[PDB]
Amino acid sequence: PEFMVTPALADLQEQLYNGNEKSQLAAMSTLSTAGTEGYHLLQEFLKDSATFSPPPAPWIRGQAYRLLFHSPEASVQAFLQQHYPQGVIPLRSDRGVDYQELAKLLVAEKFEAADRLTTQKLCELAGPLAQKRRWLYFTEVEQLPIPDLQTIDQLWLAFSLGRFGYSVQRQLWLGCGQNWDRLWEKIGWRQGKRWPRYPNEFIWDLSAPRGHLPLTNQLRGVQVLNALLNHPAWTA
């Protein structure tokens, strides 16, 4: 047996475990409105779904974790403290970089703050000089570690329903015939004839276009973003 019982919630449970992504997301959303039993089912799903192979989209467990994270139930918060104290996405670095705060900001939907920290973390990864400079040379981007970039991308995917991340930007860019002008329009980085004003003219929630976040500053040209989107992390 795949899971433990619950009956108005029985079909919701089967959908959560065995549904396609759209069905799973709808099911967990509804379960989060179904009180103590609904949240218990989501807890069980986090436990059970860890066994699924191959890897499901990271925002299925990410959003389930988010719903639990937002629960008022003391039992749920204890569960999360006991089993997921640093969230649900593995945090991996080759350079001892801490991504716990990025994970916390993202689950809490603090997308502007998370984007600020993401930019800072790339500079941290590039070493002390970059960290002080507060921006990157494209050659530094080419050399960022795969595990670190994957952690950052997985966090953005997991907490954006798959809408945000460098890997999303890569896919949209490749799908735009690698044309940067098309990309800027596709991901919402144009305000008429100028760049949008940072931060107020960007969209800091999941209504934003796919690929909208994270931000890479275009005022110094496309070379940094080009290095990010062509990085070996996305085909490793």
mmCIF file of C-alpha atoms in Angstrom:
data_model
loop_
_atom_site.group_PDB
_atom_site.id
_atom_site.type_symbol
_atom_site.label_atom_id
_atom_site.label_comp_id
_atom_site.label_asym_id
_atom_site.label_seq_id
_atom_site.Cartn_x
_atom_site.Cartn_y
_atom_site.Cartn_z
ATOM 1 C CA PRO A 1 0.000 0.000 0.000
ATOM 2 C CA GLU A 2 1.303 3.382 -1.141
ATOM 3 C CA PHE A 3 -0.044 5.396 1.797
ATOM 4 C CA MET A 4 -2.218 5.467 4.921
ATOM 5 C CA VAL A 5 -5.947 6.238 4.444
ATOM 6 C CA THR A 6 -7.692 9.434 5.601
ATOM 7 C CA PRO A 7 -13.315 10.209 2.709
ATOM 8 C CA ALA A 8 -14.078 13.593 1.171
ATOM 9 C CA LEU A 9 -10.236 13.715 1.167
ATOM 10 C CA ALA A 10 -9.607 10.209 -0.235
ATOM 11 C CA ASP A 11 -9.529 11.208 -3.907
ATOM 12 C CA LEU A 12 -7.431 14.283 -2.997
ATOM 13 C CA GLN A 13 -4.855 11.989 -1.403
ATOM 14 C CA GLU A 14 -4.660 9.648 -4.435
ATOM 15 C CA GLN A 15 -4.301 12.723 -6.718
ATOM 16 C CA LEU A 16 -1.542 14.150 -4.513
ATOM 17 C CA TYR A 17 0.504 10.942 -4.769
ATOM 18 C CA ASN A 18 -0.285 9.721 -8.306
ATOM 19 C CA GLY A 19 -1.548 12.757 -10.208
ATOM 20 C CA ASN A 20 0.206 14.736 -12.858
ATOM 21 C CA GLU A 21 1.810 17.967 -11.613
ATOM 22 C CA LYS A 22 -1.296 20.060 -12.196
ATOM 23 C CA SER A 23 -3.452 17.606 -10.280
ATOM 24 C CA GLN A 24 -0.956 17.295 -7.390
ATOM 25 C CA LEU A 25 -0.748 21.048 -6.961
ATOM 26 C CA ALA A 26 -4.526 21.441 -6.936
ATOM 27 C CA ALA A 27 -4.880 18.563 -4.461
ATOM 28 C CA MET A 28 -2.369 19.885 -1.939
ATOM 29 C CA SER A 29 -3.871 23.383 -2.155
ATOM 30 C CA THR A 30 -7.280 21.958 -1.276
ATOM 31 C CA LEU A 31 -5.860 19.734 1.458
ATOM 32 C CA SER A 32 -4.367 22.846 3.097
ATOM 33 C CA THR A 33 -7.952 24.147 3.577
ATOM 34 C CA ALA A 34 -9.137 20.815 5.059
ATOM 35 C CA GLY A 35 -7.853 21.361 8.612
ATOM 36 C CA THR A 36 -5.823 19.005 10.787
ATOM 37 C CA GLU A 37 -6.469 15.926 8.626
ATOM 38 C CA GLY A 38 -5.570 17.819 5.417
ATOM 39 C CA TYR A 39 -2.212 18.919 6.850
ATOM 40 C CA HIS A 40 -1.501 15.431 8.211
ATOM 41 C CA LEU A 41 -1.937 14.049 4.697
ATOM 42 C CA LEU A 42 0.569 16.630 3.412
ATOM 43 C CA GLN A 43 3.079 15.608 6.100
ATOM 44 C CA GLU A 44 2.703 11.993 5.084
ATOM 45 C CA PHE A 45 3.157 12.974 1.428
ATOM 46 C CA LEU A 46 6.477 14.691 2.222
ATOM 47 C CA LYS A 47 7.675 11.520 3.929
ATOM 48 C CA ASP A 48 6.399 9.118 1.323
ATOM 49 C CA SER A 49 7.230 11.052 -1.870
ATOM 50 C CA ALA A 50 10.934 11.093 -1.052
ATOM 51 C CA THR A 51 11.079 7.545 -2.507
ATOM 52 C CA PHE A 52 9.778 8.562 -5.963
ATOM 53 C CA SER A 53 12.198 7.932 -8.861
ATOM 54 C CA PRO A 54 13.098 9.511 -11.189
ATOM 55 C CA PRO A 55 13.112 12.957 -9.510
ATOM 56 C CA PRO A 56 9.743 14.747 -9.778
ATOM 57 C CA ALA A 57 9.690 18.484 -10.348
ATOM 58 C CA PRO A 58 11.166 20.111 -7.216
ATOM 59 C CA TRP A 59 8.150 22.410 -6.702
ATOM 60 C CA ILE A 60 5.846 19.468 -5.914
ATOM 61 C CA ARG A 61 7.642 18.776 -2.614
ATOM 62 C CA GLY A 62 8.579 22.483 -2.453
ATOM 63 C CA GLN A 63 4.982 23.663 -2.518
ATOM 64 C CA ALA A 64 3.874 20.907 -0.132
ATOM 65 C CA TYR A 65 6.559 22.060 2.271
ATOM 66 C CA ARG A 66 5.424 25.654 1.789
ATOM 67 C CA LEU A 67 1.828 24.792 2.665
ATOM 68 C CA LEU A 68 2.997 23.010 5.816
ATOM 69 C CA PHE A 69 5.367 25.869 6.617
ATOM 70 C CA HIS A 70 2.380 28.257 6.519
ATOM 71 C CA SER A 71 0.174 26.028 8.744
ATOM 72 C CA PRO A 72 -0.890 27.362 12.169
ATOM 73 C CA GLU A 73 -0.847 23.820 13.639
ATOM 74 C CA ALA A 74 1.737 23.243 16.373
ATOM 75 C CA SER A 75 1.984 19.567 15.373
ATOM 76 C CA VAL A 76 2.956 20.576 11.837
ATOM 77 C CA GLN A 77 5.606 23.041 12.982
ATOM 78 C CA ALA A 78 7.083 20.378 15.292
ATOM 79 C CA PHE A 79 7.171 17.907 12.380
ATOM 80 C CA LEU A 80 8.988 20.453 10.224
ATOM 81 C CA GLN A 81 11.402 21.308 13.023
ATOM 82 C CA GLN A 82 12.116 17.601 13.615
ATOM 83 C CA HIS A 83 12.562 16.500 9.991
ATOM 84 C CA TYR A 84 13.075 19.588 7.791
ATOM 85 C CA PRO A 85 14.925 22.184 9.928
ATOM 86 C CA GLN A 86 16.768 23.494 6.845
ATOM 87 C CA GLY A 87 13.877 22.965 4.433
ATOM 88 C CA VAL A 88 13.242 20.303 1.813
ATOM 89 C CA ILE A 89 15.832 21.081 -0.889
ATOM 90 C CA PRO A 90 19.350 19.701 -0.405
ATOM 91 C CA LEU A 91 21.829 22.521 0.153
ATOM 92 C CA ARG A 92 25.095 21.698 -1.607
ATOM 93 C CA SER A 93 28.256 23.808 -1.979
ATOM 94 C CA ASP A 94 31.839 23.286 -3.116
ATOM 95 C CA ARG A 95 32.956 26.428 -1.286
ATOM 96 C CA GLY A 96 31.289 26.245 2.131
ATOM 97 C CA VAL A 97 28.564 28.703 1.096
ATOM 98 C CA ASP A 98 25.421 28.825 3.285
ATOM 99 C CA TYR A 99 22.077 28.778 1.418
ATOM 100 C CA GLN A 100 19.798 28.324 4.463
ATOM 101 C CA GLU A 101 18.668 31.945 4.467
ATOM 102 C CA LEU A 102 17.970 31.895 0.730
ATOM 103 C CA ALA A 103 15.806 28.807 1.285
ATOM 104 C CA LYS A 104 13.937 30.543 4.130
ATOM 105 C CA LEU A 105 13.292 33.708 2.118
ATOM 106 C CA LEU A 106 12.048 31.696 -0.832
ATOM 107 C CA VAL A 107 9.582 29.467 1.015
ATOM 108 C CA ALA A 108 8.214 32.611 2.668
ATOM 109 C CA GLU A 109 7.719 34.212 -0.798
ATOM 110 C CA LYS A 110 10.125 37.075 -0.039
ATOM 111 C CA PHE A 111 11.193 37.149 -3.657
ATOM 112 C CA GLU A 112 12.772 40.621 -3.688
ATOM 113 C CA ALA A 113 14.934 39.793 -0.660
ATOM 114 C CA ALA A 114 15.735 36.357 -2.107
ATOM 115 C CA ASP A 115 16.824 37.922 -5.394
ATOM 116 C CA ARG A 116 19.068 40.386 -3.496
ATOM 117 C CA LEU A 117 20.679 37.514 -1.617
ATOM 118 C CA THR A 118 21.077 35.419 -4.776
ATOM 119 C CA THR A 119 23.100 38.218 -6.399
ATOM 120 C CA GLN A 120 25.224 38.455 -3.223
ATOM 121 C CA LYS A 121 25.795 34.700 -3.132
ATOM 122 C CA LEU A 122 27.135 34.611 -6.690
ATOM 123 C CA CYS A 123 29.634 37.307 -5.688
ATOM 124 C CA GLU A 124 30.541 35.346 -2.527
ATOM 125 C CA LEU A 125 31.183 32.233 -4.653
ATOM 126 C CA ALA A 126 33.506 34.132 -6.982
ATOM 127 C CA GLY A 127 35.786 34.987 -4.015
ATOM 128 C CA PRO A 128 36.672 37.927 -1.763
ATOM 129 C CA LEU A 129 37.389 40.442 -4.550
ATOM 130 C CA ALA A 130 34.067 39.817 -6.283
ATOM 131 C CA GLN A 131 32.283 39.796 -2.910
ATOM 132 C CA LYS A 132 33.666 43.286 -2.225
ATOM 133 C CA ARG A 133 33.123 44.578 -5.796
ATOM 134 C CA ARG A 134 29.452 43.449 -5.624
ATOM 135 C CA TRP A 135 29.359 42.410 -9.290
ATOM 136 C CA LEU A 136 30.759 39.700 -11.545
ATOM 137 C CA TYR A 137 32.982 39.384 -14.578
ATOM 138 C CA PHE A 138 31.593 36.852 -17.066
ATOM 139 C CA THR A 139 34.804 34.809 -16.664
ATOM 140 C CA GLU A 140 34.009 34.456 -12.949
ATOM 141 C CA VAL A 141 30.516 33.199 -13.864
ATOM 142 C CA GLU A 142 31.980 30.563 -16.204
ATOM 143 C CA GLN A 143 33.931 29.221 -13.199
ATOM 144 C CA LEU A 144 31.139 29.005 -10.591
ATOM 145 C CA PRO A 145 30.809 25.484 -9.090
ATOM 146 C CA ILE A 146 28.058 23.225 -10.449
ATOM 147 C CA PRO A 147 26.749 22.119 -7.003
ATOM 148 C CA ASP A 148 26.297 25.730 -5.885
ATOM 149 C CA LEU A 149 24.479 26.836 -9.044
ATOM 150 C CA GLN A 150 22.289 23.737 -8.895
ATOM 151 C CA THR A 151 21.373 24.479 -5.277
ATOM 152 C CA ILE A 152 20.427 28.056 -6.108
ATOM 153 C CA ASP A 153 18.441 26.981 -9.181
ATOM 154 C CA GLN A 154 16.663 24.146 -7.389
ATOM 155 C CA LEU A 155 15.605 26.532 -4.615
ATOM 156 C CA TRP A 156 14.228 29.052 -7.126
ATOM 157 C CA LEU A 157 12.375 26.282 -9.038
ATOM 158 C CA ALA A 158 11.035 24.622 -5.889
ATOM 159 C CA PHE A 159 9.545 27.828 -4.506
ATOM 160 C CA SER A 160 8.220 29.367 -7.728
ATOM 161 C CA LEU A 161 6.004 26.548 -9.006
ATOM 162 C CA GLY A 162 8.749 26.051 -11.608
ATOM 163 C CA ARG A 163 8.400 29.607 -12.973
ATOM 164 C CA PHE A 164 11.746 31.007 -11.784
ATOM 165 C CA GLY A 165 15.408 30.035 -12.101
ATOM 166 C CA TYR A 166 18.409 30.209 -14.397
ATOM 167 C CA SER A 167 17.416 26.874 -15.917
ATOM 168 C CA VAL A 168 14.024 28.349 -16.833
ATOM 169 C CA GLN A 169 15.730 31.363 -18.407
ATOM 170 C CA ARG A 170 18.001 29.005 -20.362
ATOM 171 C CA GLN A 171 15.053 27.053 -21.719
ATOM 172 C CA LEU A 172 13.140 30.229 -22.682
ATOM 173 C CA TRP A 173 16.265 31.674 -24.345
ATOM 174 C CA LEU A 174 16.908 28.524 -26.359
ATOM 175 C CA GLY A 175 13.199 28.548 -27.293
ATOM 176 C CA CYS A 176 13.493 32.216 -28.438
ATOM 177 C CA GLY A 177 16.124 31.175 -31.016
ATOM 178 C CA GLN A 178 18.784 32.504 -28.622
ATOM 179 C CA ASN A 179 17.687 36.044 -29.453
ATOM 180 C CA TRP A 180 18.210 38.328 -26.446
ATOM 181 C CA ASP A 181 15.635 40.918 -27.597
ATOM 182 C CA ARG A 182 12.970 38.236 -27.725
ATOM 183 C CA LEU A 183 14.044 36.982 -24.310
ATOM 184 C CA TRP A 184 13.730 40.392 -22.618
ATOM 185 C CA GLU A 185 10.154 40.666 -23.882
ATOM 186 C CA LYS A 186 9.316 37.046 -22.968
ATOM 187 C CA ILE A 187 10.520 37.337 -19.319
ATOM 188 C CA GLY A 188 9.244 40.851 -18.679
ATOM 189 C CA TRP A 189 12.532 42.785 -18.559
ATOM 190 C CA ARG A 190 11.387 45.647 -20.840
ATOM 191 C CA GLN A 191 9.527 48.832 -19.898
ATOM 192 C CA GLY A 192 8.839 50.383 -23.291
ATOM 193 C CA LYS A 193 12.202 51.597 -24.613
ATOM 194 C CA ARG A 194 14.163 51.168 -21.379
ATOM 195 C CA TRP A 195 14.992 48.566 -18.783
ATOM 196 C CA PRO A 196 12.528 48.392 -15.872
ATOM 197 C CA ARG A 197 13.523 50.400 -12.815
ATOM 198 C CA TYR A 198 14.927 48.222 -10.019
ATOM 199 C CA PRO A 199 13.312 47.216 -7.783
ATOM 200 C CA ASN A 200 9.896 48.851 -8.070
ATOM 201 C CA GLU A 201 9.048 47.967 -11.711
ATOM 202 C CA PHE A 202 9.755 44.263 -11.375
ATOM 203 C CA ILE A 203 7.079 41.741 -10.288
ATOM 204 C CA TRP A 204 7.951 40.107 -6.950
ATOM 205 C CA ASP A 205 5.365 37.331 -6.883
ATOM 206 C CA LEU A 206 4.250 34.262 -8.841
ATOM 207 C CA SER A 207 2.114 36.344 -11.216
ATOM 208 C CA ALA A 208 5.411 37.378 -12.870
ATOM 209 C CA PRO A 209 6.238 35.921 -16.288
ATOM 210 C CA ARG A 210 8.099 32.602 -16.382
ATOM 211 C CA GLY A 211 11.824 33.370 -16.219
ATOM 212 C CA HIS A 212 11.309 36.792 -14.599
ATOM 213 C CA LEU A 213 13.617 35.930 -11.664
ATOM 214 C CA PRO A 214 16.349 35.798 -10.599
ATOM 215 C CA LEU A 215 17.575 39.130 -11.994
ATOM 216 C CA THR A 216 20.879 39.563 -13.808
ATOM 217 C CA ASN A 217 21.797 43.228 -14.337
ATOM 218 C CA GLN A 218 21.829 44.133 -18.063
ATOM 219 C CA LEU A 219 23.311 47.629 -17.686
ATOM 220 C CA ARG A 220 26.812 46.157 -18.369
ATOM 221 C CA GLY A 221 25.704 44.001 -21.333
ATOM 222 C CA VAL A 222 24.697 40.383 -21.783
ATOM 223 C CA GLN A 223 28.002 38.545 -21.187
ATOM 224 C CA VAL A 224 27.278 37.594 -17.545
ATOM 225 C CA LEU A 225 23.807 36.228 -18.343
ATOM 226 C CA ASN A 226 25.202 34.492 -21.399
ATOM 227 C CA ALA A 227 27.773 32.766 -19.173
ATOM 228 C CA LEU A 228 25.042 31.809 -16.670
ATOM 229 C CA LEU A 229 22.711 30.298 -19.251
ATOM 230 C CA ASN A 230 25.511 28.372 -20.994
ATOM 231 C CA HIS A 231 27.056 27.093 -17.715
ATOM 232 C CA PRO A 232 27.739 23.326 -17.479
ATOM 233 C CA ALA A 233 25.380 23.074 -14.485
ATOM 234 C CA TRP A 234 22.336 22.860 -16.778
ATOM 235 C CA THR A 235 23.589 19.828 -18.781
ATOM 236 C CA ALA A 236 25.533 18.053 -16.027
#
